[PDB]
Amino acid sequence: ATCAVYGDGHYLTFDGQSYSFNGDCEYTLVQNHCGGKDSTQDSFRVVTENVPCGTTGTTCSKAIKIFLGGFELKLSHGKVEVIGTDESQEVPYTIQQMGIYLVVDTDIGLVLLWDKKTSIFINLSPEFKGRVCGLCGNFDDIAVNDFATRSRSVVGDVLEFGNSWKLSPSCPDALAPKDPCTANPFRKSWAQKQCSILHGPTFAACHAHVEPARYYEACVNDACACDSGGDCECFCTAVAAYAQACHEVGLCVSWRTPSICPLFCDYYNPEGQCEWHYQPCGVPCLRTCRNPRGDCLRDVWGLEGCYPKCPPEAPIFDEDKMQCVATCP
Amino acid sequence: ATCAVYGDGHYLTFDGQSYSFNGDCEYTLVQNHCGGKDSTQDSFRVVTENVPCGTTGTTCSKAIKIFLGGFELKLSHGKVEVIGTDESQEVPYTIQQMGIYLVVDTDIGLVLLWDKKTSIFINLSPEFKGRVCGLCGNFDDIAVNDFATRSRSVVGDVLEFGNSWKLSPSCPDALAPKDPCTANPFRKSWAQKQCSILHGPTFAACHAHVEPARYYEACVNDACACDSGGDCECFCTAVAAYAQACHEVGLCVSWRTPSICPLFCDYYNPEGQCEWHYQPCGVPCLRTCRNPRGDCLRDVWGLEGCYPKCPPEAPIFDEDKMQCVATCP
Ligand SMILES: [Ca+2]
Ligand SMILES: [Ca+2]
Numbered sequence: 001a002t003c004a005v006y007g008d009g010h011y012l013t014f015d016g017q018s019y020s021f022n023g024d025c026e027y028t029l030v031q032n033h034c035g036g037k038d039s040t041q042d043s044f045r046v047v048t049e050n051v052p053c054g055t056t057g058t059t060c061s062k063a064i065k066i067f068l069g070g071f072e073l074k075l076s077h078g079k080v081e082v083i084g085t086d087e088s089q090e091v092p093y094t095i096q097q098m099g100i101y102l103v104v105d106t107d108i109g110l111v112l113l114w115d116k117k118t119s120i121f122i123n124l125s126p127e128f129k130g131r132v133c134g135l136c137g138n139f140d141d142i143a144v145n146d147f148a149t150r151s152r153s154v155v156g157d158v159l160e161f162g163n164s165w166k167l168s169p170s171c172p173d174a175l176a177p178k179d180p181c182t183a184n185p186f187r188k189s190w191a192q193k194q195c196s197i198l199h200g201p202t203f204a205a206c207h208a209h210v211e212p213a214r215y216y217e218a219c220v221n222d223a224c225a226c227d228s229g230g231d232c233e234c235f236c237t238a239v240a241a242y243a244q245a246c247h248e249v250g251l252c253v254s255w256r257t258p259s260i261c262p263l264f265c266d267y268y269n270p271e272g273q274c275e276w277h278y279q280p281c282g283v284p285c286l287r288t289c290r291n292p293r294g295d296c297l298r299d300v301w302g303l304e305g306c307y308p309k310c311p312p313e314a315p316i317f318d319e320d321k322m323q324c325v326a327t328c329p
Numbered sequence: 330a331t332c333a334v335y336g337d338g339h340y341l342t343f344d345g346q347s348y349s350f351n352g353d354c355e356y357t358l359v360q361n362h363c364g365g366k367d368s369t370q371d372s373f374r375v376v377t378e379n380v381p382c383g384t385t386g387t388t389c390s391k392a393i394k395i396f397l398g399g400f401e402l403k404l405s406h407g408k409v410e411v412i413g414t415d416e417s418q419e420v421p422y423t424i425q426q427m428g429i430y431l432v433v434d435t436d437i438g439l440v441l442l443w444d445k446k447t448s449i450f451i452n453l454s455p456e457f458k459g460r461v462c463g464l465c466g467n468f469d470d471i472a473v474n475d476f477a478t479r480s481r482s483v484v485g486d487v488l489e490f491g492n493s494w495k496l497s498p499s500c501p502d503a504l505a506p507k508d509p510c511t512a513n514p515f516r517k518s519w520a521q522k523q524c525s526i527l528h529g530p531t532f533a534a535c536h537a538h539v540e541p542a543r544y545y546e547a548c549v550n551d552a553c554a555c556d557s558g559g560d561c562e563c564f565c566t567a568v569a570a571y572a573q574a575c576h577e578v579g580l581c582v583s584w585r586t587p588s589i590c591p592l593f594c595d596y597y598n599p600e601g602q603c604e605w606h607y608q609p610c611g612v613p614c615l616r617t618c619r620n621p622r623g624d625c626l627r628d629v630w631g632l633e634g635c636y637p638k639c640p641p642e643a644p645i646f647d648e649d650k651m652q653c654v655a656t657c658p
Contacts, residue, residue, distance in 0.1 A: 190558035190559070229516055230561070264593065266592070266595060266607050267585075268587075274603035278595050
């Protein structure tokens with residue numbers, strides 16, 4: 001159970017519902033109290049804005065704003081921005097970047113994952129079941145009642161469900177998308193050649209467990225649509241979505257190849273030093289000044305991305321100068 | 330003095346002449362005896378074929394064939410293929426891959442550099458001056474007489490000069506190219522943003538020496554034209570052309586950034602081992618079973634690409650399993 005918003009309008013609910021829509025507006029994914037009685041009076045809210053990326057019109061998210069007790073977080077250009085420093089209580093969120101994921105976790109039990117480019121995953125702890133409303137549907141493990149359109153009513157119109165959670169009072173109404181591959185037929189051969197890796201023998205373990213046909217067509221559509229420049233990032237995000245979906249099951253897999261989506265972990269390594277090896281499965285509990293060896297958050301998973309390989313001498317990471325120091329003074 | 334064929338129809342002669350043309354045919358760059366008296370009776374010849382890469386019609390080279398004493402080399406799909414094993418004399422060429430360059434050298438003194446995708450550079454030793462004919466012009470350090478169109482005549486028509494060196498008797502005549510950026514105006518902003526790095530402070534050392542305006546517009550044109558997919562490779566080749574042109578002067582520079590054209594030298598490193606650090610300047614003389622420490626070819630330059638960093642124990646490279654073994658048994 002985890003919200004899966006990625007690429008161009010691909011969504012997967014907690015209860016396991018897959019739909020699609022595109023719209024250039026502001027939307028909220030997770031709300032507290034559903035606008036009613038404030039039971040826990042926390043009023044958590046996560047919102048996002050879509051920009052017309054790509055000439056096909058298939059917009060993708062650009063910025064994410066998080067509201068928590070009068071505290072606001074702005075995510076844009078790969079840098080975290082905070083607006084509003086309430087002089088009460090304290091900081092309730094932790095900002096941590098792991099691999100190619102930007103992770104923010106709340107003391108309430110809310111965990112968000114950010115690829116810093118397009119994708120985003122939201123998971124909810126079981127104590128908040130049912131009483132959550134948004135585009136991700138009610139967290140009740142029932143794919144039937146996940147279409148509550150701000151009025152406790154389930155409607156078969158995915159477009160109506162998506163439009164019901166717009167934020168700007170004066171914002172253009174979203175509409176059904178076109179066919180990216182029919183729009184760009186000349187890219188179809190290259191797109192199929194690139195996205196065929198998912199059905200290749202490398203991902204056979206996940207193929208034997210889940211059905212990647214939806215993710216396969218998602219990769220094809222994303223590659224077809226991405227035509228204004230930098231299609232490599234579109235393809236990499238499309239693949240990494242299914243990679244994470246397989247990883248969260250529990251069985252680690254490896255899919256990176258120097259010809260496709262190549263990381264450059266050597267760059268962070270300074271001169272005369274080599275302590276950054278890519279970890280496919282995902283690093284276990286680490287040690288650093290902020291998070292000691294004995295302390296770790298197990299709600300996170302292996303994920304992916306370059307991680308430092310600190311020497312046995314000074315294995316603690318610093319997180320301020322991106323190196324392994326013995327201890328932060 | 331070095332032939333510089335790269336991207337989509339970009340050529341620079343030994344004597345320093347820059348022109349451009351595109352054509353889907355077979356052409357010869359360097360010929361021996363110019364079809365006349367065989368002085369050294371070596372009859373060296375390098376030929377190439379152009380394929381309609383990209384929807385703009387700007388073709389780029391795909392395969393290179395080398396003729397040397399009845400020995401033929403086929404270069405396609407990133408793998409070297411040899412056709413014709415004469416049962417006389419011996420092998421006169423050495424096939425070696427260094428960094429992101431595939432290098433073949435002849436005992437005569439001919440050196441070729443291959444990026445395995447599009448680009449190619451040809452240098453000539455001084456003993457072969459003047460008596461060489463081809464698209465690269467006569468090797469006499471004179472930009473005036475480099476337009477010999479197979480008849481010892483210089484013609485101001487670059488198109489005519491290019492067509493005069495076609496090989497297939499029945500092959501379509503080449504024509505002047507269009508404007509890639511006018512063809513794809515929506516890509517102009519992204520292309521300028523990507524190609525502006527050359528004029529950025531990183532390459533100021535070469536900016537203070539050579540004039541990169543031609544290379545700047547070449548990068549812009551290449552990024553504009555590359556639209557059928559994989560524009561990242563087009564941009565990377567366009568940048569690396571100027572990078573090599575600056576490197577051959579003598580002053581080493583660094584331009585790689587994990588956000589742009591990122592190498593994945595970590596991949597070659599096996600588990601528990603980190604002995605592949607990217608070298609910007611280019612590795613000095615190496616040691617291996619084929620080429621010992623005392624033996625090295627100094628005609629080559631630093632170039633670029635991932636190189637192994639063998640430990641002080643077993644520093645010899647094997648070249649058969651891509652690792653550093655003590656000595657080949
Ligand atoms: Ca539901
Ligand atoms: Ca000349």
